Design a protein around this ligand. Sequence first.
Ligand SMILES: *[C@@H]1O[C@H](CO)[C@@H](O[C@@H]2O[C@H](CO)[C@@H](O)[C@H](O)[C@H]2NC(C)=O)[C@H](O)[C@H]1NC(C)=O
Ligand SMILES: *[C@@H]1O[C@H](CO)[C@@H](O[C@@H]2O[C@H](CO)[C@@H](O)[C@H](O)[C@H]2NC(C)=O)[C@H](O)[C@H]1NC(C)=O
Ligand SMILES: *[C@@H]1O[C@H](CO)[C@@H](O[C@@H]2O[C@H](CO)[C@@H](O)[C@H](O)[C@H]2NC(C)=O)[C@H](O)[C@H]1NC(C)=O
Ligand SMILES: *[C@@H]1O[C@H](CO)[C@@H](O)[C@H](O)[C@H]1NC(C)=O
Ligand SMILES: *[C@@H]1O[C@H](CO)[C@@H](O)[C@H](O)[C@H]1NC(C)=O
Ligand SMILES: *[C@@H]1O[C@H](CO)[C@@H](O)[C@H](O)[C@H]1NC(C)=O
Ligand SMILES: *[C@@H]1O[C@H](CO)[C@@H](O)[C@H](O)[C@H]1NC(C)=O
Ligand SMILES: *[C@@H]1O[C@H](CO)[C@@H](O)[C@H](O)[C@H]1NC(C)=O
Ligand SMILES: *[C@@H]1O[C@H](CO)[C@@H](O)[C@H](O)[C@H]1NC(C)=O
Ligand SMILES: *[C@@H]1O[C@H](CO)[C@@H](O)[C@H](O)[C@H]1NC(C)=O
Ligand SMILES: *[C@@H]1O[C@H](CO)[C@@H](O)[C@H](O)[C@H]1NC(C)=O
Ligand SMILES: *[C@@H]1O[C@H](CO)[C@@H](O)[C@H](O)[C@H]1NC(C)=O
Lengths: 107, 451, 451, 451
Amino acid sequence: TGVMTQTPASVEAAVGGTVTIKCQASQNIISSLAWYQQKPGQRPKLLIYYASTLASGVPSRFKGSGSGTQFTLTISDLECADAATYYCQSYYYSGITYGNAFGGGTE
Amino acid sequence: TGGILHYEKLSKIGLVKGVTRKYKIKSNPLTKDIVIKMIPNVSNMSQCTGSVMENYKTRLNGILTPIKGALEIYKNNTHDLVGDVRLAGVIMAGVAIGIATAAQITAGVALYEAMKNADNINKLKSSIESTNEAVVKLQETAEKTVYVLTALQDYINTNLVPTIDKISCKQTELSLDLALSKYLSDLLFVFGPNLQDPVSNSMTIQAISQAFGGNYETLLRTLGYATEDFDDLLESDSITGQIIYVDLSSYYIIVRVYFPILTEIQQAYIQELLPVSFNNDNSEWISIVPNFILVRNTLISNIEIGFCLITKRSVICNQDYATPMTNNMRECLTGSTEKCPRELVVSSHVPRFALSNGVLFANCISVTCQCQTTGRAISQSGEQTLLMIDNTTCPTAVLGNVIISLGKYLGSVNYNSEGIAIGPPVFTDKVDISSQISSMNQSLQQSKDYI
Amino acid sequence: TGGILHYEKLSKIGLVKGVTRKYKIKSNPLTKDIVIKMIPNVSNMSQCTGSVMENYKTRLNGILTPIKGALEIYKNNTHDLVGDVRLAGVIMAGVAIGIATAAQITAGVALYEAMKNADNINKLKSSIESTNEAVVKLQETAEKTVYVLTALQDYINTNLVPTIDKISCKQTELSLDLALSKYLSDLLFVFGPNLQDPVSNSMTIQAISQAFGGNYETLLRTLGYATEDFDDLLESDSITGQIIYVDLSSYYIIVRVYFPILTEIQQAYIQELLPVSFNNDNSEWISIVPNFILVRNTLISNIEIGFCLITKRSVICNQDYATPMTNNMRECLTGSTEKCPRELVVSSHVPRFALSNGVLFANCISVTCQCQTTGRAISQSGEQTLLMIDNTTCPTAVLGNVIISLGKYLGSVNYNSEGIAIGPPVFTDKVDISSQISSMNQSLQQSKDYI
Amino acid sequence: TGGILHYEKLSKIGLVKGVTRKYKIKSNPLTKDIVIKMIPNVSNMSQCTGSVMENYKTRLNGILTPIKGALEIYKNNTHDLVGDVRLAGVIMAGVAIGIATAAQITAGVALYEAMKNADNINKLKSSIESTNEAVVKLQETAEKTVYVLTALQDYINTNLVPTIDKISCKQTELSLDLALSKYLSDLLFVFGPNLQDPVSNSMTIQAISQAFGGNYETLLRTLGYATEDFDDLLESDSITGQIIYVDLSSYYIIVRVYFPILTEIQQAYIQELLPVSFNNDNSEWISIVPNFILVRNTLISNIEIGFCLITKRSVICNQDYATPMTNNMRECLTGSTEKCPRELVVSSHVPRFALSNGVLFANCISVTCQCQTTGRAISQSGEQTLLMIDNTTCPTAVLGNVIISLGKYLGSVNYNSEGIAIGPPVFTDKVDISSQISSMNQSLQQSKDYI
Ligand SMILES: *[C@@H]1O[C@H](CO)[C@@H](O[C@@H]2O[C@H](CO)[C@@H](O)[C@H](O)[C@H]2NC(C)=O)[C@H](O)[C@H]1NC(C)=O
Ligand SMILES: *[C@@H]1O[C@H](CO)[C@@H](O[C@@H]2O[C@H](CO)[C@@H](O)[C@H](O)[C@H]2NC(C)=O)[C@H](O)[C@H]1NC(C)=O
Ligand SMILES: *[C@@H]1O[C@H](CO)[C@@H](O[C@@H]2O[C@H](CO)[C@@H](O)[C@H](O)[C@H]2NC(C)=O)[C@H](O)[C@H]1NC(C)=O
Ligand SMILES: *[C@@H]1O[C@H](CO)[C@@H](O)[C@H](O)[C@H]1NC(C)=O
Ligand SMILES: *[C@@H]1O[C@H](CO)[C@@H](O)[C@H](O)[C@H]1NC(C)=O
Ligand SMILES: *[C@@H]1O[C@H](CO)[C@@H](O)[C@H](O)[C@H]1NC(C)=O
Ligand SMILES: *[C@@H]1O[C@H](CO)[C@@H](O)[C@H](O)[C@H]1NC(C)=O
Ligand SMILES: *[C@@H]1O[C@H](CO)[C@@H](O)[C@H](O)[C@H]1NC(C)=O
Ligand SMILES: *[C@@H]1O[C@H](CO)[C@@H](O)[C@H](O)[C@H]1NC(C)=O
Ligand SMILES: *[C@@H]1O[C@H](CO)[C@@H](O)[C@H](O)[C@H]1NC(C)=O
Ligand SMILES: *[C@@H]1O[C@H](CO)[C@@H](O)[C@H](O)[C@H]1NC(C)=O
Ligand SMILES: *[C@@H]1O[C@H](CO)[C@@H](O)[C@H](O)[C@H]1NC(C)=O
């Protein structure tokens, strides 16, 4: 099946610093990864799709990277409003191979 | 090669000697396998796929399942017993097969021999599904490098993903569905119900390549085939492929390409005769005689040239296309010109002269023959069928509006003076042949009733 | 099904019993109409059209006008009188038609029956011109939803409008003109002067779909056709279309798709014989006999298989392709083996064994027959034509390099010991057939003159 | 045109008179040259070409070299002597040519006549290499404006250069290589070893245009050809091209398009007969007779219609396709109905009525004939073969489900009462024809041995 190993579960970083989140897929997903932002008591907010493309209206300090099995999410120039739980998800659909899963999440 | 066809008498009845070609037949095939993915990778444009890919998968499964079952009929009933000195091959379950031709059974044996490398290739099944390029090379231990061709993958990568920004998602989805449907429409002619016996290595690689849009050049060059007779093998339908595995879950197939080498058939040539209309009894005629004669070990036989590739140097065939010849035709080619039939010429356009060994053979009654050297016309009497024009008669002849210089004829010095016996007239039209047969039955029956 | 072909004697002369297939013929067509727009909508790229669209309109009108006139010949001369109990159909003006075949008149009747839904569709003419998508669905009152396919519209939308920014207007105009000209070059083979009788429902949907780039899969799936025999109906040329309206002002046409269902012909089967070379008089021979025999109500007739689709289970045809058989051929298939002719085998490659009901029928003089069970060779004397190999003689036979296990033969226990009478030899080559006919006329004439 | 076929008796044996068409044959060709560049200009995307262009150049040289050598065989051996009053043409070296047909020598003459404009065009060789558009026009002194078509140039300009930003360089290189390989796969069928004699103007322009993707419409409209019979000339294979120059260094060729005009053959027509099954001896039959008869100067001959284009008005052919007819067939068409053979009808579907001059000719035993005017059925006795239905018998006839009004028959008033003599039965199947021939040899031999 498809699973997503997202590290780390939680992380601390000062305002103005950079934080790195990583997502690992059990199978190759060919750059078909998304990144979401979720604040407590709120619906998720789309951040990045296709591992690199930034969603409209999302600050450029959120930077996604990766291909295949390994992907990273980097948040530079950290702000107070950035504190939230961050998830990744695979929407891989070659046509014959189905890979869909959510990351465990990073606080 | 020598002469056993009595070409002089044949020339007098309008059959001019043509080019002598070699006889080459395919043999010793070189086997290479290749994977063909019938479903493109749409991961980079998955948002606009909709349900198109599911419908396409259903249709492609409907197409592919009969091929898999036909192959399984032999795969399930072919057993590889533990090898030893008593048996050197595998056994075919004749009762289980039930009814099969010799070629089909040999193709089943070939399918078994393919099964080994087919199993080796299928170890990379997860990698095959992950491929997103039109042509890709798979390496894992530098052993039997697997090549994978994917259908429509180049269209997905160069025409739909680049324009995904520019056009709406529904437009992109419709374009994808149209591409898949056109691929199915073109692929159906080869892989549909027309493909009755998938257990056969007789299908040409050009037909096999329809799964890859008919780009057999890419398929062949990817596997690394290279030979001087690449084009000669291709055009003579000698390069063939065989489906050796079908995956209904992943929608890909493995084909085994049979690449042979041309071998010159020793002590064999193929002589061609150029038909020319000759005049007899104030009428024009054409000898109804094999234009291509196969001679092998000085044995005259007919040949089914239509299935062969004719080049200037040789005749290339994917099998022996020799056919028997009746004794009367062989006696006429032997030199009994009264045995070759002829047919009336009523068409305004028919070959009325030819050129062999620098010597002309012209119907100077139908055409206007003039001698450019002497400046006087070349006339042909009614008693003679053809006219031989050479250096003794005319150094530079003029046939219509062509001016050709001639050589010297090497036959009888009195060719135009000797003459020969004309054969019988015939009618080659189909309904005419039926009419002739029926009138013959009536004449024979009247004679028998008189008896 | 039963046996009426005397298969044992036939097997002795090299005709091995093959698969028995059903007889299926199309019938009961399901009619659906669809609009095909032969001119794409270029409104979104009108600046780079230039005069290309006008030239294309002129050329397409030149192509389309003869079709419209041919249809009008029947449309103008077909009158629908006020229906009542005295007449139940429409009348055809025979004097006005002048000369017509039966099929052409029936097609004119079908054109009339189409005219109703054709008029309903043409109410949406303004909407048809406004369509800018390759496939579009038209709804107005949920009555007879009209589908419209537009040629080259997908190319306009996905390849020219997206790149209009990237390339010059002259480049885009040239590309558009090239696309239209290629469409005309490919469409001309089907809709040009080759289409002599547009008043006919005999043209296959694959040919009809050339107006839509040959994507007949999209055309058929859009109308919603679905059946288990979709591929069988397609490949057997049973799904046909008929042009029922041509608009020269708007450059679109309406075609009526005839989608039939296959019906099993009761009390009828089609038996196949597998030819195998047999030895006689130190020579190899092949029986010149119908490889496919049609039996219906225990009546043997020939069949024109070439126009039918052969599957493993049945023979699918778009009409009855039965043909008569001469009484001598029927008597040989009946069991008079001296009535079937034979032909000399000179080719190095010809089927020399076959497998039926787990039993082998091999020319063990031409091929090397060995018994894997006993370890000794299987020899065939000169007096016997073929060799029957089964479980009594050899449990596991080896033919060349194939090892096949066998069943038990159910015929005469002394098959290899009985023998049969060989027929006469023949020559099937075309020029050879003419030569044989002519020599026959000469022999018959000599006999008559002696009488 | 007149009547010489005795159509009444023919109608009684199921041959209904059809349409009378003219006879048109091509002549007087108009010659225009055009350059075809087989290699696209990739200068604007040179970074992603890699080694693809070198491999393509090598392969294309391998393909093109034989054509150049074949043309050089005639070019090197054709000499233009200083013109004067003694000679008005060029001389062909017969000894150097060796063996050649008449058509090949005439094609060599045409190649010479092309060489002048070919040399004029080749003066612009540097400009030809620099062209980067699919269609380009070359002017230098307003003399013989040279047109240049470039293969795949539209794909380079509209699909690869615009997407060079969007996809990787390796992706673009693979797409380019795939395009070139597909072009080679499609071009090989026409320009590969299948093209044996490049010294010939007999190849159709549609085949020639495969070097330009088969867009012969662009090729023809660029040169400026325009005629009412454009489509008629195209579909009848009358517009032909000839390769007159091959450049192996620049990978382009020059072809000479032969554009003829159709000429009506005076005092000649082509009559068609509509076959209809007629009943005799409680059986159905079809006359085995030429469905198309050529009459020219009141001389009946067969015609090879298959190579001609049939339109409603005339028969268009690229040469004279007349063939002789046996005297028995000509006597039957003359009016001796016992000379035309017939064949048993066993198929469920065969034409059983036809319509000529508003008069019906129906097998009212097989079909149900009813008179809509009188309301009573139309019955046909067993003694009569066909039924003539016209205004005297039935003003409005009903054949199956078609209702057709009729005219008045102009033949004998007692057509249905006179009757005629039926011919002999035949069997047209191939193996059946061989069987009949063989049984005839056996009967004739038994009779000779009795003598
Ligand atoms: C050739 O003519 C003979 C005439 O006797 C045909 O022979 C028989 O034809 C009659 C005609 O009705 C049949 O009833 C018989 O069954 C036939 N056979 C025998 C043994 O008498 C013969 O069929 C004709 N063949 C061809 C090919 O035209
Ligand atoms: C079979 O041979 C006979 C020989 O008598 C041919 O019959 C006639 O042939 C002569 C030859 O010039 C013609 O002049 C006559 O017009 C023919 N018919 C009659 C009634 O005498 C016959 O044509 C030959 N048929 C075939 C098919 O070879
Ligand atoms: C028609 O039958 C005759 C029977 O005499 C065949 O004639 C000869 O056939 C024998 C049979 O072995 C040969 O040995 C001879 O060489 C043949 N020719 C001569 C001159 O005797 C004849 O071949 C048969 N033809 C057809 C077309 O069936
Ligand atoms: C898929 O998309 C990613 C990100 O846009 C890109 O890096 C990759 O090259 C694309 N692959 C294909 C086969 O188009
Ligand atoms: C062949 O064997 C496999 C596995 O036993 C089975 O799934 C398949 O249905 C068999 N096919 C046939 C035609 O017997
Ligand atoms: C005729 O041709 C022969 C063959 O090449 C040659 O040897 C001879 O000299 C020629 N005679 C002439 C041209 O007078
Ligand atoms: C035509 O252009 C408009 C505006 O650019 C766009 O909204 C529309 O989708 C386009 N239609 C097609 C068929 O391309
Ligand atoms: C058919 O009738 C229409 C309208 O009367 C007319 O325009 C057209 O020319 C007619 N066609 C023929 C072939 O008579
Ligand atoms: C031979 O084949 C028959 C048919 O299946 C079988 O019943 C019999 O047992 C076989 N005999 C052997 C293999 O000895
Ligand atoms: C080549 O590129 C130049 C600069 O980008 C452009 O001006 C020119 O039109 C292009 N030519 C072709 C044939 O694409
Ligand atoms: C033709 O002549 C040219 C120049 O003399 C030469 O390069 C070429 O090889 C010749 N070709 C043949 C077939 O003789
Ligand atoms: C029968 O047809 C002829 C031919 O047009 C016509 O002159 C005659 O009036 C018709 N007679 C009828 C319909 O009674």
